[PDB]
mmCIF file of C-alpha atoms in Angstrom:
data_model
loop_
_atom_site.group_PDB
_atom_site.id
_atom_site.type_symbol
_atom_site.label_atom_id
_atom_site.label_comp_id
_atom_site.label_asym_id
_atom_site.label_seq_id
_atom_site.Cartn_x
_atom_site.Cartn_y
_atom_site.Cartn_z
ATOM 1 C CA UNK A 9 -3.469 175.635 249.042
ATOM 2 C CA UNK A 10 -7.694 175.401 249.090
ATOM 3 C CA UNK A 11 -8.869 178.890 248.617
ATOM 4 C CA UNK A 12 -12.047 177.423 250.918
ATOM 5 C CA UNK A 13 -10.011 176.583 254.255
ATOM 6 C CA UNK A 14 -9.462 179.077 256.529
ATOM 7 C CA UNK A 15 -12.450 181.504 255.063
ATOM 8 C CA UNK A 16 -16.115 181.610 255.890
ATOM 9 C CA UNK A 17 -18.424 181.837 252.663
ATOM 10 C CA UNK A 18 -20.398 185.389 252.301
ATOM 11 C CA UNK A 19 -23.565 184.842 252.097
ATOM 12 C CA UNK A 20 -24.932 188.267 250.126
ATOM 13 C CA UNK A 21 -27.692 190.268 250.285
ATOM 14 C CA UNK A 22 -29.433 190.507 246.871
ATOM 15 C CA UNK A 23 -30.572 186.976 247.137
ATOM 16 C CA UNK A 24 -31.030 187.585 250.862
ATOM 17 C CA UNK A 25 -33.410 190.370 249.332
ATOM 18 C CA UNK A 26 -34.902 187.963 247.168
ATOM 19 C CA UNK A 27 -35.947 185.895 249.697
ATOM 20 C CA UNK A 28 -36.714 188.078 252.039
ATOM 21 C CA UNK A 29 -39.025 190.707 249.873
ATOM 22 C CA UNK A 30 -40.352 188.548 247.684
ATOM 23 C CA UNK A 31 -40.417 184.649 248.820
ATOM 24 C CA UNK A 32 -41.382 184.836 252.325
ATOM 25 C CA UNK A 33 -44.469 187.309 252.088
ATOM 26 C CA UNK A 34 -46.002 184.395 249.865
ATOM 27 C CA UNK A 35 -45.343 181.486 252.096
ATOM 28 C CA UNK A 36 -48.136 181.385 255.152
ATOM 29 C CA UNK A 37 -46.765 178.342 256.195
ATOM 30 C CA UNK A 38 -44.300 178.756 259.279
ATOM 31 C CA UNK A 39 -42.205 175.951 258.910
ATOM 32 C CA UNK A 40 -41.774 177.077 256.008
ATOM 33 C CA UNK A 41 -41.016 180.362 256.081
ATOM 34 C CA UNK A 42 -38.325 179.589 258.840
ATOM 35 C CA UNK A 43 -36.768 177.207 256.399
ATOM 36 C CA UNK A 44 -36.832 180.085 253.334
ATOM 37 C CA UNK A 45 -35.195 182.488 255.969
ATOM 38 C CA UNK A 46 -32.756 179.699 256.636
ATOM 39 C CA UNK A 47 -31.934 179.353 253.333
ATOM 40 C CA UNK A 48 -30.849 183.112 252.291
ATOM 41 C CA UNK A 49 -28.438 182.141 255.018
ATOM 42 C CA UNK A 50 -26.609 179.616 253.084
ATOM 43 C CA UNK A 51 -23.735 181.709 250.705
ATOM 44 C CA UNK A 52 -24.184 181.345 246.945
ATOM 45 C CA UNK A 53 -22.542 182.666 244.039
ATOM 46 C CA UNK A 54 -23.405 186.222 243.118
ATOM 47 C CA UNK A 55 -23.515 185.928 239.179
ATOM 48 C CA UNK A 56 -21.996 188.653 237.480
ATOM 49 C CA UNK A 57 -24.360 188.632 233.713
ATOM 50 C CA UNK A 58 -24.238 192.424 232.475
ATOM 51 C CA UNK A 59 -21.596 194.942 233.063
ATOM 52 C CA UNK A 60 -24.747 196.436 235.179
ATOM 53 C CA UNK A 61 -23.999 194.056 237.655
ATOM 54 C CA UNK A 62 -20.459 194.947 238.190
ATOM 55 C CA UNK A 63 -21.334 197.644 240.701
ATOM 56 C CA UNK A 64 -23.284 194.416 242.850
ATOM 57 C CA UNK A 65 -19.307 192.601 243.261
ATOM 58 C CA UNK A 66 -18.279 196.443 244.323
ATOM 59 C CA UNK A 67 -20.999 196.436 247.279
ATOM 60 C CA UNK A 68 -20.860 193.122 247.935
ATOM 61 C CA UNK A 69 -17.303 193.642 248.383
ATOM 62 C CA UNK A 70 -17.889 196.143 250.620
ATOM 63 C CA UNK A 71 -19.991 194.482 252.759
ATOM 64 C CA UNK A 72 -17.194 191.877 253.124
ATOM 65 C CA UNK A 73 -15.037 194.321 253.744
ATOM 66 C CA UNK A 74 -17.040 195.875 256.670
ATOM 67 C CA UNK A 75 -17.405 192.150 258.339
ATOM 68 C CA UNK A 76 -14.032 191.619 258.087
ATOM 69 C CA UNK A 77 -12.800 194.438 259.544
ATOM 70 C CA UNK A 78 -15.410 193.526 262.578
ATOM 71 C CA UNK A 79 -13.650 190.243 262.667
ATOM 72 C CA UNK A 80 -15.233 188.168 260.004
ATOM 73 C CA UNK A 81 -12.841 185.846 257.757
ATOM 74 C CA UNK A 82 -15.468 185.455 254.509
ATOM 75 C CA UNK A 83 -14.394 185.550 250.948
ATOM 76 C CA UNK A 84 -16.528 186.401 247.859
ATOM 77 C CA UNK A 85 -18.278 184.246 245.238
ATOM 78 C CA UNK A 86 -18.473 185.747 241.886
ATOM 79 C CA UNK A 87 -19.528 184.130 238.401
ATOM 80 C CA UNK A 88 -17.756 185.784 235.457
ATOM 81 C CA UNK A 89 -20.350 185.724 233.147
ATOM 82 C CA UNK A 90 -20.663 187.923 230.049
ATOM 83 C CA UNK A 91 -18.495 186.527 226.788
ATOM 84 C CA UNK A 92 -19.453 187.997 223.735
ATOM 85 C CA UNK A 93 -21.653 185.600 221.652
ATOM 86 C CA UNK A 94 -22.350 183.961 224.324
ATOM 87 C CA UNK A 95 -23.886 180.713 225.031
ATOM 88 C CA UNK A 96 -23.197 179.886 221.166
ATOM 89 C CA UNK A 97 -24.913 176.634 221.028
ATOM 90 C CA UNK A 98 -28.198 177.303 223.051
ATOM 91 C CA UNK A 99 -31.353 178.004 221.092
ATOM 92 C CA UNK A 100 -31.180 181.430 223.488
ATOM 93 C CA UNK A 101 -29.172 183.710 225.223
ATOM 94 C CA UNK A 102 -29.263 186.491 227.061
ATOM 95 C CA UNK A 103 -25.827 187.795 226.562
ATOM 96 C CA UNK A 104 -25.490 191.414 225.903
ATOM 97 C CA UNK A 105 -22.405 191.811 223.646
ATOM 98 C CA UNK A 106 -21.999 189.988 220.229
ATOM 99 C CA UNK A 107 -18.653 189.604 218.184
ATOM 100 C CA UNK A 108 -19.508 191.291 215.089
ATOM 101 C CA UNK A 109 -20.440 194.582 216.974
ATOM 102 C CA UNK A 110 -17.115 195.572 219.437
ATOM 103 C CA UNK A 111 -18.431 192.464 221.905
ATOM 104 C CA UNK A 112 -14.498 191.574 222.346
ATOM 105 C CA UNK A 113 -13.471 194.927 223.124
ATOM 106 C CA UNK A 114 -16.816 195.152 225.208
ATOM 107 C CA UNK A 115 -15.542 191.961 226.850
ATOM 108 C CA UNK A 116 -12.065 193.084 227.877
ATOM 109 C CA UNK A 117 -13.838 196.717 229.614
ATOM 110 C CA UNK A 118 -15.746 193.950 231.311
ATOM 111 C CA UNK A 119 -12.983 192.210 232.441
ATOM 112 C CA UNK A 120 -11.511 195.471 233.409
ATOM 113 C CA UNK A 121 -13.691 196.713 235.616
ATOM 114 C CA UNK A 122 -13.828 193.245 237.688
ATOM 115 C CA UNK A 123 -9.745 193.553 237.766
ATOM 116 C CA UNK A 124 -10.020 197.453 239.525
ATOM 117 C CA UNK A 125 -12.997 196.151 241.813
ATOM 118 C CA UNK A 126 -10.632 193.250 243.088
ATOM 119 C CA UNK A 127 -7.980 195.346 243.335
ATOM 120 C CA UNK A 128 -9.944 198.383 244.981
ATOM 121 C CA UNK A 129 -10.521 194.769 247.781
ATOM 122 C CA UNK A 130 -7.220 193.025 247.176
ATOM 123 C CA UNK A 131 -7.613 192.824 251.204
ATOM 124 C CA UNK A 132 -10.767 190.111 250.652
ATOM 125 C CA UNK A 133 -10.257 186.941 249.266
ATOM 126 C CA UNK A 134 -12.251 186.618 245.975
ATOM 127 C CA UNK A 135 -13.478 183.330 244.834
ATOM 128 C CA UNK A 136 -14.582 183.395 241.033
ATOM 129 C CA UNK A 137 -16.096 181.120 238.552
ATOM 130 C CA UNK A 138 -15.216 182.044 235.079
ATOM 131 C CA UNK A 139 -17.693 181.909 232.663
ATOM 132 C CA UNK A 140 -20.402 178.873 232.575
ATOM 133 C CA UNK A 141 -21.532 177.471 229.093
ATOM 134 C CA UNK A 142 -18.380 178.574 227.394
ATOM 135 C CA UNK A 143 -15.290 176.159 226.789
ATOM 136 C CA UNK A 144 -17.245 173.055 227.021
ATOM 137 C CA UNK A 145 -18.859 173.995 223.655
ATOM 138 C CA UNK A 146 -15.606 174.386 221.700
ATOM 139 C CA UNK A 147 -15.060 170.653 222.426
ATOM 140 C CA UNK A 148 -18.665 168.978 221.871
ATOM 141 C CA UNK A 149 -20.508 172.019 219.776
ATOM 142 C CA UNK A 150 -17.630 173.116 216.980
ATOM 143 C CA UNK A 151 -20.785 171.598 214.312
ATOM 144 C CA UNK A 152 -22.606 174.518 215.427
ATOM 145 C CA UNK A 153 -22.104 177.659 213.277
ATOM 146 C CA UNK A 154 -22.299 180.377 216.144
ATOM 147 C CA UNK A 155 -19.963 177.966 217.928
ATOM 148 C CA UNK A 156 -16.870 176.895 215.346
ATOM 149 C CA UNK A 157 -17.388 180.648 214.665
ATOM 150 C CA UNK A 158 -16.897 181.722 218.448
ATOM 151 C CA UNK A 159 -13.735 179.888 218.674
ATOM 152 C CA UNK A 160 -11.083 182.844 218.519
ATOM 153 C CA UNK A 161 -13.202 185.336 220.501
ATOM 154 C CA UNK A 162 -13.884 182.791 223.597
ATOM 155 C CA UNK A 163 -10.154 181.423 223.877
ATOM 156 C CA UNK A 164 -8.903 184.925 223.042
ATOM 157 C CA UNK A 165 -11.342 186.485 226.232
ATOM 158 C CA UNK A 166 -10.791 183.679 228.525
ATOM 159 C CA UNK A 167 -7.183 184.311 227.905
ATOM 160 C CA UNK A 168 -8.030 187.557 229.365
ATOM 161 C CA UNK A 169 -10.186 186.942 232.119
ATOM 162 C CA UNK A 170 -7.315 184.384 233.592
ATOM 163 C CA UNK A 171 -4.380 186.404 232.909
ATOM 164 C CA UNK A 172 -6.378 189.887 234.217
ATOM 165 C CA UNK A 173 -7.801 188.423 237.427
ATOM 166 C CA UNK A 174 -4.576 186.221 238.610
ATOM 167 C CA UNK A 175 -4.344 188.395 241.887
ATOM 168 C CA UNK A 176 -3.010 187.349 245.129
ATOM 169 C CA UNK A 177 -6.528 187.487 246.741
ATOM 170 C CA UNK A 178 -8.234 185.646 243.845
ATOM 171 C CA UNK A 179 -8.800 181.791 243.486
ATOM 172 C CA UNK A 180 -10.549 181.144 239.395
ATOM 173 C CA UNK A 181 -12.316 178.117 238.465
ATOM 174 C CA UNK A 182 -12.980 178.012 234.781
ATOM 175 C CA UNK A 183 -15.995 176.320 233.763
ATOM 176 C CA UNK A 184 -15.971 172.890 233.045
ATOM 177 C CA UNK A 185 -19.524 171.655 232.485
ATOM 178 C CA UNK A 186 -20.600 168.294 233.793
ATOM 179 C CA UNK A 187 -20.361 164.462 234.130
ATOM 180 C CA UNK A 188 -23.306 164.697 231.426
ATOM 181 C CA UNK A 189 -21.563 167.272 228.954
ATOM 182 C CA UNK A 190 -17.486 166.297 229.040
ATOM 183 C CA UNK A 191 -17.797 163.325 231.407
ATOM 184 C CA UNK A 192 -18.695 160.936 228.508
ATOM 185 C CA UNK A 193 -15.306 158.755 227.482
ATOM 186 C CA UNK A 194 -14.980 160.024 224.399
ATOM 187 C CA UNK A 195 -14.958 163.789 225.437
ATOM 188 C CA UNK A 196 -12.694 163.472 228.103
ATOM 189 C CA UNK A 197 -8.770 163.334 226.268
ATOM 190 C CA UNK A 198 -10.078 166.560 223.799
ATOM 191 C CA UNK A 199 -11.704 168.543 227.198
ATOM 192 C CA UNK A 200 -8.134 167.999 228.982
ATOM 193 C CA UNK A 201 -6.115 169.546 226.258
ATOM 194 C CA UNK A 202 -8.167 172.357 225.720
ATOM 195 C CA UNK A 203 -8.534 173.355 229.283
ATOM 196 C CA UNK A 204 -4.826 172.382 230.166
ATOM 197 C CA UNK A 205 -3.819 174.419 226.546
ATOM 198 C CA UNK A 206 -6.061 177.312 227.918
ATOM 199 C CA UNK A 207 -3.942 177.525 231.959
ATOM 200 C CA UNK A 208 -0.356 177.224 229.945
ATOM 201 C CA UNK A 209 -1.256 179.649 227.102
ATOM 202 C CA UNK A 210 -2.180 181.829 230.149
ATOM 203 C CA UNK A 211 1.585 181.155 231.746
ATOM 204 C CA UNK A 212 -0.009 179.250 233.650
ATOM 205 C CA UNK A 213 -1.596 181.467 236.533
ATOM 206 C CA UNK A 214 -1.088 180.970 240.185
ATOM 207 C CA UNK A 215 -5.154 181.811 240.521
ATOM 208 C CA UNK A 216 -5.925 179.893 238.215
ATOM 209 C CA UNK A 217 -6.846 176.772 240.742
ATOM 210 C CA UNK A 218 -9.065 174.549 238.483
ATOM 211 C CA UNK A 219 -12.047 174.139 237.005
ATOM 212 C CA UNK A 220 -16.103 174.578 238.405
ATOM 213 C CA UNK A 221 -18.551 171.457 237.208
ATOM 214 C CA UNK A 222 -22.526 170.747 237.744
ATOM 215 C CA UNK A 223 -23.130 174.899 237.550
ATOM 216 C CA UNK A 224 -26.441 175.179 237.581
ATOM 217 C CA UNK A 225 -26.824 171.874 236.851
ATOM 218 C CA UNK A 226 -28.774 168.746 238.743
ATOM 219 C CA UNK A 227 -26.242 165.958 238.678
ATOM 220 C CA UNK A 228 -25.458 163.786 241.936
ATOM 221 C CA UNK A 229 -22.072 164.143 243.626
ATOM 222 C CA UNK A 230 -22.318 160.695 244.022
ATOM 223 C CA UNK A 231 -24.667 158.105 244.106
ATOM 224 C CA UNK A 232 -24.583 154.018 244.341
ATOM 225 C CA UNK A 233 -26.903 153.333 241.097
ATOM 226 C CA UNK A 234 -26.353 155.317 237.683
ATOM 227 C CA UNK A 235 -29.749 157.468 237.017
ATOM 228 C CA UNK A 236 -31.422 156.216 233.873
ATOM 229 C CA UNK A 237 -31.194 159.080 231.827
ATOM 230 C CA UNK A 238 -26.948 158.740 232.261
ATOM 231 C CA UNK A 239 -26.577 155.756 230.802
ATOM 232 C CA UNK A 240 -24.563 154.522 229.253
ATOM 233 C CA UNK A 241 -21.428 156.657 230.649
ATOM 234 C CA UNK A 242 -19.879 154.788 232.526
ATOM 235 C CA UNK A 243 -18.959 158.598 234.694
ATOM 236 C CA UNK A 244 -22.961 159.050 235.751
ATOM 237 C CA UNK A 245 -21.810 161.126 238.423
ATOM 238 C CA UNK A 246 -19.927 164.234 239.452
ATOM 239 C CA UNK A 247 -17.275 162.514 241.523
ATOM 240 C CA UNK A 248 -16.529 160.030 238.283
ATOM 241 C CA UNK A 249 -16.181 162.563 235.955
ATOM 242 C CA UNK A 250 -13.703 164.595 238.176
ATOM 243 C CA UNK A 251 -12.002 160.951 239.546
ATOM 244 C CA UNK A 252 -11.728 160.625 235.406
ATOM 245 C CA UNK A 253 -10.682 164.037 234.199
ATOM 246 C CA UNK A 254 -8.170 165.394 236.869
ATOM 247 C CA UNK A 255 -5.416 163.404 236.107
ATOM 248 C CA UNK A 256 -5.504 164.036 232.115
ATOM 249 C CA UNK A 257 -5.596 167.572 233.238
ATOM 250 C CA UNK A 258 -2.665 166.859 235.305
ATOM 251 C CA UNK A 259 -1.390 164.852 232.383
ATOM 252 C CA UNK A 260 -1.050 167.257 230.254
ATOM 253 C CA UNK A 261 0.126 170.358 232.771
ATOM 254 C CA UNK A 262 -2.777 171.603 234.454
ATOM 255 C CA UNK A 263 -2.744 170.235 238.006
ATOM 256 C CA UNK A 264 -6.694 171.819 238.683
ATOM 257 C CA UNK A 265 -8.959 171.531 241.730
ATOM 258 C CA UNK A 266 -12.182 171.278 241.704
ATOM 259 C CA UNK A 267 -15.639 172.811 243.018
ATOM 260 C CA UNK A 268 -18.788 171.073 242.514
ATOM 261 C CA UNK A 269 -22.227 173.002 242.595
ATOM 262 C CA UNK A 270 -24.444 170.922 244.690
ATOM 263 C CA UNK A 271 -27.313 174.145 245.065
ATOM 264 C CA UNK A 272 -29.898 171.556 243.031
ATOM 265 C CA UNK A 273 -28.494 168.479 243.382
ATOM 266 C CA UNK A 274 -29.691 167.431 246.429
ATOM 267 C CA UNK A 275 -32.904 164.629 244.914
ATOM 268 C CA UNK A 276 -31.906 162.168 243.154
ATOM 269 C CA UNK A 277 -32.441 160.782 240.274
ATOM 270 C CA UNK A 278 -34.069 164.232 238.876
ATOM 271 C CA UNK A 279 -36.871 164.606 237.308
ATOM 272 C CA UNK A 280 -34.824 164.819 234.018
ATOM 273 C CA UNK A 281 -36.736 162.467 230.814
ATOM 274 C CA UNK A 282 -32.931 162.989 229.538
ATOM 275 C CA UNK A 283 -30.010 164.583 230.843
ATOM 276 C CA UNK A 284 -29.041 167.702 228.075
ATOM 277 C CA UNK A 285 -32.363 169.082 229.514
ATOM 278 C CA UNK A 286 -31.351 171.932 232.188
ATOM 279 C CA UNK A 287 -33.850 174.553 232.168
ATOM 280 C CA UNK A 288 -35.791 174.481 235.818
ATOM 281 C CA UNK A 289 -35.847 170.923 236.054
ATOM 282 C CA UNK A 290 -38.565 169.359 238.010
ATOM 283 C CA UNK A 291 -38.361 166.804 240.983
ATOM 284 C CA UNK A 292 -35.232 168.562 242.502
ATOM 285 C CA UNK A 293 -33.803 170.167 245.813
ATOM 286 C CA UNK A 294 -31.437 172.066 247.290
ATOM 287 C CA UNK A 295 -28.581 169.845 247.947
ATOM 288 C CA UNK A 296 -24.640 169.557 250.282
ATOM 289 C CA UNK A 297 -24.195 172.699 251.919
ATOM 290 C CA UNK A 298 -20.910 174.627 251.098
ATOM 291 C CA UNK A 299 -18.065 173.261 252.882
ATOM 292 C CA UNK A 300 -14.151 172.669 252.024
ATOM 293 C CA UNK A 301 -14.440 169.332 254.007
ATOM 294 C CA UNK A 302 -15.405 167.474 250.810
ATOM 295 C CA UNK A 303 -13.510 164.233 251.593
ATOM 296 C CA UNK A 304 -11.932 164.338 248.299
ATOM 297 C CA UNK A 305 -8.320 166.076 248.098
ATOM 298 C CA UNK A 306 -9.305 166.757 243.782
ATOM 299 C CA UNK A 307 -12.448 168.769 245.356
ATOM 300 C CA UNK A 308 -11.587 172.154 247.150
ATOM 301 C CA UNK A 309 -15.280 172.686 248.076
ATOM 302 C CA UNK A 310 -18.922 171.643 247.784
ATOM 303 C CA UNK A 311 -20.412 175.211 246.414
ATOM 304 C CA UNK A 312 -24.454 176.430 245.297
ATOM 305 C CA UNK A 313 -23.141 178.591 242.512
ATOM 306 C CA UNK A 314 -26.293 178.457 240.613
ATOM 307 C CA UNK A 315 -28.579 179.926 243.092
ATOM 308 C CA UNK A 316 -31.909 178.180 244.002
ATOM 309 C CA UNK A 317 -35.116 180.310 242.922
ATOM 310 C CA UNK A 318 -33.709 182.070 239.883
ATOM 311 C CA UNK A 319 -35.622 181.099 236.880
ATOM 312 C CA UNK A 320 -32.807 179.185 234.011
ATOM 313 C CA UNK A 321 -35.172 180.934 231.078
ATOM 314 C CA UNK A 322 -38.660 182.023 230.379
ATOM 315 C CA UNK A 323 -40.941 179.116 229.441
ATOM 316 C CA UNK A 324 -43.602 181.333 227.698
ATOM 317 C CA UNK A 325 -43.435 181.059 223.590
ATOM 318 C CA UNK A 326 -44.155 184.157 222.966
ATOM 319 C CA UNK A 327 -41.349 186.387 225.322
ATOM 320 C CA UNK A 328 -38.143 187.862 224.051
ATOM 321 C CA UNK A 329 -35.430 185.052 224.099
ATOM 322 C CA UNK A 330 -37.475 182.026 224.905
ATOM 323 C CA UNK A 331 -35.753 178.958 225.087
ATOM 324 C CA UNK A 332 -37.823 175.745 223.630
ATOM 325 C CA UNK A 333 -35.741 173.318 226.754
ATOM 326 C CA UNK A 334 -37.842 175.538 229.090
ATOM 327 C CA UNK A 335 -40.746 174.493 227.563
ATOM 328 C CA UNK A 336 -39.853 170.869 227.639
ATOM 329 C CA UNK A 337 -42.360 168.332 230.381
ATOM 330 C CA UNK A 338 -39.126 168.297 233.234
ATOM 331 C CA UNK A 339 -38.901 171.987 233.527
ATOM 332 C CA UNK A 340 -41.499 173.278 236.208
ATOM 333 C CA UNK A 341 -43.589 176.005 234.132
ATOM 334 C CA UNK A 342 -44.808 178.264 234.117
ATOM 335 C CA UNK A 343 -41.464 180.291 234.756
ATOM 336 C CA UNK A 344 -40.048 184.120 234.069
ATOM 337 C CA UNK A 345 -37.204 184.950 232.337
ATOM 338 C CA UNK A 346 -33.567 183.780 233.439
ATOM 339 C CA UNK A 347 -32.615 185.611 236.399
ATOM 340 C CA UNK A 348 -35.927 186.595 238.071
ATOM 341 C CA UNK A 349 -37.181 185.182 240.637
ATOM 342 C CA UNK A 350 -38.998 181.618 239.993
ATOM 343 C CA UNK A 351 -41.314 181.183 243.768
ATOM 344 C CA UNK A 352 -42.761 177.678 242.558
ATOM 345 C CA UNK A 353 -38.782 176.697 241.528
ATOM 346 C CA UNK A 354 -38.107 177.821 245.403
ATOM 347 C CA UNK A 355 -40.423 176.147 246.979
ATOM 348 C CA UNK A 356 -39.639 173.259 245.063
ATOM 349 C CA UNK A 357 -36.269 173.179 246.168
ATOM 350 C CA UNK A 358 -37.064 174.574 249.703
ATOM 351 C CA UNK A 359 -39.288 170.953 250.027
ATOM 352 C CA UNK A 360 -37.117 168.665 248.281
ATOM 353 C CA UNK A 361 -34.028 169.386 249.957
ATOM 354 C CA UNK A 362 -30.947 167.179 251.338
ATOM 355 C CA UNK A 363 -30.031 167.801 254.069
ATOM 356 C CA UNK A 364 -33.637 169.164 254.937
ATOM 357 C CA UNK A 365 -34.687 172.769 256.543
ATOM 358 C CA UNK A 366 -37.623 171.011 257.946
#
């Protein structure tokens, strides 16, 4: 039933490129390049952002294809990542479509297109993450206008996106946020029905396997002593918060899996002066590599989803769509705008990491 046994993980080439044409030429140390080439080796999550990116799944999908037919046995990693009104409690977002101009309509072409590209490769398995920084706001954020005013749109396109993409060659994971975000007590009996209302409002979809958590987030797996900046929940970790939320999924219908993204996790505690800050957090390294041999039967697979290098936001004042958290002392400035490629953020990680390239 894990959609990450019996299935190597593609590692793709746009942040093999990244590495490659724009990391290594600025490294002259050669431990440390070997290490950088190392890790464009390890397979992250290819984030889908803009409909422009929706010709990157098509190659990449090709590429698997090609392997495959030369005996390979990988599957894809895709984020679904482009709701309308996006992101409706941050400060910033760089989401292209907006409600009040066609973004729903916009949204379902979106979704669309992904559906013919998985079908055009219904031969490759097709691992997806559906849409970070979405659902977790409708149960902590509904006091934030863009947010309680979201509501119908995001439940109405995730509807979509889960009923669209329930292939036989997918596997979804809906996002779920973190230990930090819905892992609190008091969060965790309103999370459960919403994402167990979302799976059986859905008919509840074979692909739909369970839920993503830590996305491009810092938080241990697990560790022996809570981090500071988690008290006082009691679920300071990722393991507690699944451990605590999987059965009132379960509870209520939704019998999900889970994959945690360990690509920053790996120092701990972070260099986090409190744990809603997430933009290019200092003191932090790569962490678990992606396996399915977790340990845990709730977790299908250990997963970088978030991939290491990629700025989270611009921390200059003055740019289009600056975010003040990347601004903040704990995120590593100065850093480009989300998406491009952050080399001190890199290196960082590259240094930091557990289990070490050195």
């Amino acid at each position: 039933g894990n959609p990450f046994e019996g299935v190597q993980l593609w590692a793709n080439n746009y942040y093999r490129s990244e590495v490659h044409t724009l990391a290594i030429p600025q490294i002259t140390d050669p431990a440390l390049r070997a290490a950088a080439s190392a890790a464009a080796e390890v397979p992250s999550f290819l984030w889908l952002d803009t409909l422009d990116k929706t010709p990157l799944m098509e190659q990449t999908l090709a590429d698997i294809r090609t392997a495959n037919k030369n005996g390979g046995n990988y599957a894809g990693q895709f984020v679904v990542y482009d709701l309308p009104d996006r992101d409706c409690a941050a400060l910033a977002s760089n989401g292209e479509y907006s409600i009040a101009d066609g973004g729903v309509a916009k949204y379902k072409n979106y979704i669309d297109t992904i559906r013919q590209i998985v079908v055009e490769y219904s031969d490759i398995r097709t691992l997806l993450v559906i849409e970070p920084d979405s659902l977790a706001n409708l149960v902590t954020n509904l006091g934030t206008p863009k947010c309680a005013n979201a509501q119908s749109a995001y439940l109405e396109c995730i509807n979509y996106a889960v009923t669209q993409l329930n292939l036989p060659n997918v596997a979804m994971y809906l996002d779920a946020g973190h230990a930090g975000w819905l892992g609190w007590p008091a969060n965790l009996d309103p999370a459960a029905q919403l994402f167990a209302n979302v799976y059986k409002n859905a008919s509840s979809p074979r692909a739909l396997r369970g839920l993503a958590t830590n996305v491009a987030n810092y938080n241990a797996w697990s560790i022996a002593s809570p981090p500071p900046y988690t008290s006082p929940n009691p679920n300071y970790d990722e393991k507690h918060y699944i451990e605590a939320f999987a059965p009132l999924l379960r509870n209520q219908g939704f019998d999900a899996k889970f994959i945690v993204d360990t690509g920053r996790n790996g120092k701990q505690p972070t260099g986090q002066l409190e744990w809603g800050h997430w933009c290019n957090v200092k003191g932090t390294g790569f962490g678990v590599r992606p396996t399915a041999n977790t340990g845990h039967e709730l977790v299908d697979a250990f997963v970088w989803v978030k991939p290491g290098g990629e700025s989270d936001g611009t921390s200059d004042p003055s740019a289009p769509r600056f975010d003040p958290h990347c601004a903040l002392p704990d995120a590593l400035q100065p850093a480009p705008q989300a998406g491009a490629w952050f080399q001190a953020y890199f290196v960082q990680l590259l240094t930091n990491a557990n289990p070490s390239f050195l």
